[PDB]
Amino acid sequence: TYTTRQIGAKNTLEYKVYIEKDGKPVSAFHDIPLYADKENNIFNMVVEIPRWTNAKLEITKEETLNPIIQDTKKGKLRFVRNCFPHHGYIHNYGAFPQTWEDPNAVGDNDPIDVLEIGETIAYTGQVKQVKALGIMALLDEGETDWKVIAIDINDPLAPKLNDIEDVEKYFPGLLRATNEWFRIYKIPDGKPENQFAFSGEAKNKKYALDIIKETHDSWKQLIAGKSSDSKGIDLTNVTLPDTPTYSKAASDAIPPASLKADAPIDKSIDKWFFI
């Protein structure tokens, strides 16, 4: 059973979320199997950011057991601003564990990103089981920043969704909103409009699976200690006994759950930008 352990108050620099397996912290990057059901391509997704929230939460590669923390720049907590007509993130946003876009266009140096499109709003550190529907390629300064489009297998519509064309049928306009969102979401931060490969097209399930599998193989090399360069990445794990960086003690070293209410978010984050 996967649960979460929160350290610190939400919306502060101290906030960290660890994933627990049967009460014990594990690495959110390395210890959660990519596949819930390999034969049927059911993936575990680690959720970082709930739909319609603003705080830019991410698995941190550099801290032991890779908790989810809020992104910072020069000491300041980072938020996505509201970009009309959107409110925060428009997907449950996260990543596949045991994947890595090896930067050694080029890998983006993180687990492959996942947009989960189902009805229910997720929680930070949730491990849910999803099926892949397709994939888009956002460009980020020469890096290929893939966005997998997926749905929770427990979603009421999941049986009716198998490939990318089904997203057009049951979620008309969501692909367009996705294109627009990733194009404009940094404009309020003083950055340019972003660009997609393939003229913004979403490639199909088959294509997505090939990319996901490649990033899993890269992670296999990484965790084995065999990548050409893993600088800045903590590979400590508590479930892979034959890896050089196995250390069960790392689980015990994590502090207990925080006793704290969410810190308030500055009211400026409410603002709707027309851009």
Site for a copy of itself in 67-86 (CB under 8 A): 84-86
Measured between alpha carbons, how far is residue 116 from residues 31, 39, 194 in Å?
21, 21, 21
Q: Is 20 exposed, middle or buried (0-12, 13-18, 19+ CB in 10 A)?
A: middle
Q: Which does 102 bind (CB under 5 to 8 A by kind): Mg ion, a copy of itself, none?
A: none
Q: Cβ closer to a copy of itself: 100 or 171?
A: 171
For residues 203 and 262, what is the distance between their CA atoms, to the nearest angstrom?
39
Distance, CA of 27 to chain centre: 14
Pick the stretch among 6-14, 89-97, 114-122, 183-191 that binds Mg ion (CB under 5 A).
Answer: 89-97
Q: How far is CA 17 from CA 34, 61, 88, 170, 205, in A?
A: 19, 13, 20, 33, 31
Q: Is 89 tagged catalytic?
A: yes
Annotated binding-site residue? 81: no
Residue 56 or residue 251: which is nearer to Mg ion going by CB?
A: 56
Which of 78, 62, 82 has the alpha carbon at shortest distance from 70?
78
Choose, by CB under 5 A, the member of 31, 113, 116, 234 that binds Mg ion: 113
Q: Give the nearest distance from C-beta 80 to a copy of itself in angstroms.
A: 14
- Residues with Cβ < 8 Å from 262, sequence gap 6 or more? 9, 10, 11
Residue (34 or 117) nearer to a copy of itself, CB: 117
Taking the C-alpha atoms of residue 154 and residue 150, their distance in angstroms, rounded to an integer, is 12
Binder among 17, 34, 90, 222 for a copy of itself (CB under 8 A):
90
Site for Mg ion (CB under 5 A): which residue of 15, 29, 51, 108? Answer: 108
Stretch 112-131 residues interacting with a copy of itself (CB under 8 A): 119-121
Closer CB to a copy of itself, 120 or 239, in the complex: 120
Write out the two tokens for 272: 């709707």
Q: Check binding of 177 to a copy of itself (CB under 8 A).
A: yes
Choice from 31, 116, 145, 152 touching Mg ion (CB under 5 A) = 145
CA distance 75 to 157: 42
Structure tokens at 27: 């690495």
The residues that touch a copy of itself, with contacts defined as CB under 8 A, are 51-52, 84-87, 90, 119-121, 170-174, 177, 267-268, 270-272, 274
Enumerate the active-site residues: 89
The residues that touch Mg ion, with contacts defined as CB under 5 A, are 95, 108, 110, 113, 145
Task: Please enumerate, by residue number, every residue annotated as part of a binding site for diphosphate.
Answer: 78
Task: Please enumerate, by residue number, every residue annotated as part of a binding site for Mg(2+).
Answer: 108, 113, 145
